[PDB]
Amino acid sequence: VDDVTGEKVREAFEQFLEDFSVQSTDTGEVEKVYRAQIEFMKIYDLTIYIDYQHLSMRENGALAMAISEQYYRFLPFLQKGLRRVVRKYAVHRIRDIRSEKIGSLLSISGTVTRTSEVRPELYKASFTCDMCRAIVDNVEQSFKYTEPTFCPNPSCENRAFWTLNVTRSRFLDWQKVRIQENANEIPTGSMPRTLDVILRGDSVERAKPGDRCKFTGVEIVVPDTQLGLPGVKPSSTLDTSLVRDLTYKISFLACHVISIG
Amino acid sequence: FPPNLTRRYFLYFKPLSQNCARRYKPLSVRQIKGDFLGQLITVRGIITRVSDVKPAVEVIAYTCDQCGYEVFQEVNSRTFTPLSECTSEECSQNQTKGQLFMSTRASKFSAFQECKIQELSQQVPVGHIPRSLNIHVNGTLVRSLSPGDIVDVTGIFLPAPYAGLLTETYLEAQFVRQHKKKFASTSDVEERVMELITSGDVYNRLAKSIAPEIYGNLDVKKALLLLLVGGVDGDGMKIRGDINVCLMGDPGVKSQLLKAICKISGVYTTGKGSSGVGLTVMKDPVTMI
Amino acid sequence: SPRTLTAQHLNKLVSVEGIVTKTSLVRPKLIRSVHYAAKTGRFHYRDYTDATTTLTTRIPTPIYPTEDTEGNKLTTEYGYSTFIDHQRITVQEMPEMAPAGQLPRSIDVILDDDLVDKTKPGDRVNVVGVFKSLGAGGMNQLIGFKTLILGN
Amino acid sequence: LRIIWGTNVSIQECTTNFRNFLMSFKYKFRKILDERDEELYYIKQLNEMRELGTLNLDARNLLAYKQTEDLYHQLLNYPQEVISIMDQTIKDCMVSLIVDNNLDYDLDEIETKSCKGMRELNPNDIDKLINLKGLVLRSTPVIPDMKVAFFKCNVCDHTMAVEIDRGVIQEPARCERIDCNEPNSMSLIHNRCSFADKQVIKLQETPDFTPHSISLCVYDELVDSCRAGDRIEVTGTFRSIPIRANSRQRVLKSLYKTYVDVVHVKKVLIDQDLAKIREVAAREDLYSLLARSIAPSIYELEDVKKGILLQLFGGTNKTFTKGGRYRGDINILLCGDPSTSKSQILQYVHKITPRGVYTSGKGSSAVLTAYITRDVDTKQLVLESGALVLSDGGVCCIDEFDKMSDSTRSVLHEVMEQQTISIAKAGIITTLNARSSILASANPIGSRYNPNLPVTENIDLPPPLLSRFDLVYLVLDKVDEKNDRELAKHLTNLYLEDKDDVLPVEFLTMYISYAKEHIHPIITEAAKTELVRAYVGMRKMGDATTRQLESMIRLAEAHAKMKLKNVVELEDVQEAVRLIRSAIKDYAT
DNA sequence: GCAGCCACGCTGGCCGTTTTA
DNA sequence: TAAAACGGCCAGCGTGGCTGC
Description:
Number of helices of chain D: 18
Largest sheet of chain D: 5 strands, parallel
Enzyme class (chain D): hydrolase
Radius of gyration of chain B: 29 Å
EC number (chain D): 3.6.4.12
Subunit structure (chain D): Component of the MCM2-7 complex. The complex forms a toroidal hexameric ring with the proposed subunit order MCM2-MCM6-MCM4-MCM7-MCM3-MCM5; loaded onto DNA, forms a head-head double hexamer.
Oligomer: part of a larger assembly
Largest sheet of chain B: 5 strands, mixed, barrel
Protein name (chain D): DNA replication licensing factor MCM4
Radius of gyration of chain D: 34 Å
Strand order of the largest sheet of chain D: 12-15-16-11-17
Distance between the termini of chain B: 43 Å
Strand order of the largest sheet of chain B: 1-4-5-7-6
Structural class of chain B: alpha+beta
Distance between the termini of chain D: 100 Å
Helix content of chain B: 10-25%
Family (chain D): Belongs to the MCM family.
Structural class of chain D: alpha/beta
Number of strands of chain B: 7
Strand content of chain D: 5-15%
Number of strands of chain D: 17
Largest interface: A-D, 55 and 64 residues
């Protein structure tokens, strides 16, 4: 279902980037600007620099109004298409955030406050039991520290478990800053509002407290004092003794962040 | 259905007066021994830090939603525990049991509120610190006790269940007799006011009557009478009917008149006795204020 | 004296002198429970002890009872159920009696029912009682065997 | 008849009775009102819902209407379902009206769409309608809320879903090769699932006729439907929900926690006047009519009132090609002897300013700016803007300017010169600009300003900042009798009854706002001749600097902004210079 | 060569064991 | 000492192999 929709969007965007990028003539860049971007990346070995207008150029927004709604749905499709290209060749504010904005693209500007340290990540759990073939590598990486997989195919069972291999993996570093809202848009008698933002990967350390920036359109929500909030707090009683309950909050994630302003 | 589940009413006991006891009780908090639990007492004191009234859950309804019955859980303790999926007579002896949940409109509540009573500070020993005590209020008598008053409180003395064997006590109120009857609650007023007017030389007698315990300072009493008057008030500003007269001079005038102003008119405060939070934030009690 | 009070001058009746200081709070304690059964129309009886009251190492019997034998509702009663107050205070020795130059050191003595709130912080009091040591001294799960004084 | 098990209502009597109400309203409230266009409300309002493509209602339409009185108490007792049935039959009325043309606004998609207070409120009122008022304290961030869940699996990864129930979400054991033969473990994605929006806002009331605060739990459509500090009346229904013990287990404590689930908000991110503006603009006596109508409390300081008028029409914000960046800010302080009600004048200025900030003396520090403080709920240190940031655009008001501290009044050099704020500590190293019209007042050393004495001497101000100001005024005491008679007759009339001139209260207020962007006064060549002509005579007094020249050029164009003049004129410059010269002739002593 | 009975394997429910407040 | 969670112990159901018709 989503595999088919994302696969058609994926093939059309792969054809899009494989088509012309910029309409300009020989005076300047002619064509294959994103192809020259990857060759520029081959010169530097870092990432991708994408425009919203260039993605909006080929399908006249048909493909843009496909990605701008559920981007979170289309992350691995966008990575797999770029991966096949590799093997083939080698603005709003905090008030504009709703639940319909999850997965979609929206740009937010603001005021940077309280930079944070550098901490590595994981997303490569290689955890298997006491059985001889202890060389698995869980393809899970979600927002859960569940290293050992249940069903291996050794003589070991699901309860047989051991630690995750911290030596055969690919990690990344990141920081977590909390952006403040501008003081030039807050009304009178109003205190500033806060919002968390996550800076992932290569674009790390670009932050500076006290700056105006433009952000990636994507957005996430992280699983979790929000007890007795009140609100109907869900539980995980599956359909058939007695799990935890939960109450979340809106967060933010990005991959391309320019720091203009 | 149990008859306790369908009540809609309440019952109040009634204390005996001392006149018939004379023919046929003034206790202190120190006199409240922790051995009179279950007995009938009568105390007096000062209402201090009155909490707010919040609803008390009494019985819990449980909708079957499958067999259509109603399960009921009566709770008289502070806490309780959740029950099973259904306790219907038809959900039982069947493979598919129901699934219940509570209900609000079928449950029964009751008025609940508590406060603290401070000692009279006249019956306190010469080298002790006055204690206080918690009194629970329920039902009709709720929202009827202002803090910082003098009242006769009657009740029954019951402990509460919770290092292993420490019994924390309280009092359940039964009758309220308030000393110092609140005003504004005209006949008896003009019964003395019309006589006061026809008394002759009223203006000098009025200002002469406020704090007559000093000698002299007649114009000072005139200023005190005018401070006691006050009382004054489109697309502009109103007028404040407040007077602010300062006093300079020393020394035999010095607190004799200063405490007397709050006597005739009042919280007496000093310099260091009030901090920056005193004359103008605490953890909220039982009921971020 | 509290200075030479430990190890020996132990597990006996000791006469202690000193100053009344830092009086604790007054809490009452339950001893004898009265419970009424509805259908039998009878009363019942149940007691509980702690290490302050028995003076002898007896098996502690702590939960408030209901539905004991047949299914009769053990409605508890009051008034007739007994209670006794409880209090603990500290007494350091007299400061002039101290050695060459030091901060005086102290212990505590627990009172009983008719003697609650007899010492305010700040007086001169002679005390006669019994040196009682309670608690599992670290053999529970690092220095234990905390002390107090009873029979006062 | 249709009936619900727990309630006593029906589908059709409610539907037809609501349709009866939606087809009958003839100003019945005026029939009770006795009247002291008679078409029903819902036809026109349903058309405004219809052609615009765009629920709650008030109370008097159902009281005056005799029918649906039972429907009133049914909604009063069961608001949860009656509103849904009302929207269903309103949708049906939309379809009953749309069959006239059958192509209207794309029928499928439009088809798809205070007696007493809180303290008096008994717990008996479990599910009732409560009319309340008050103010708003703060606003929590957005809380998400799942409406439809999301599930996946492991073998070929089927991803069916189910929705949220009223309290929990269920999930089967096996989904691939359905709920049989236990093939693999079900996956759960709590980010592919649907959500909702909910926000909690705590409110404080103003108990008209101990303090108490209330809260509420608005939803999707009511997100930011309230601001903080507004006088909002609150319509809602009471709730009460249990709480856990020690936030961990299922042992529910007694005394359930209660809240409010609001319905309607009283909050209220029932051009053409320009010709009248030009009529008054064509008046010859505008320079006296506009200034005289500003403050009817004082009948003097006409030059000062004119300067105050020009404070909002101050200069032309001229930035050069490279560098320059010269704003139109002007700052004028007035001072002098008491018994002038100067503070009431300044508060009136604070009232005229749409974003006025009225500060005072000895309550400020450098750290009116840099309001950095600690957070409470998140337990962090959040940097906040100061009072002058609230003055960004407009006029600020400061009292007792002579009584500032060492840090206070020294920060003002940056504002008078760069009109910036320099933040540079460990938290944030970043500057920003915040322009305003600084205006203040103070009192001299001597109770009476004596003559034959320097003005810089009898004022506790630093002389570089003293001449940095635009214009300095002097208020002196007069020994007359005539001004005291008009003073006491004027003030006696203002004091009596507790309250031949045209007094526009709001014409000037919108005139300045209209003239701020639509008026750009130009200062061409013809004025420079008179400028140098006046400037040589100005420079003749010595023993006058370029500071006074910048004062005259920013004050002449300020008057040119007045009376809607996009160019400069050789005239209006004489009194522009003379306004400064009146102060200068006061500097003889 | 096919059906019924017995033996072995798999699935579901209840009781026992462990830790925090 | 009580309550909650997970593992072990006990009970019920299904499939394959062996025996009889």
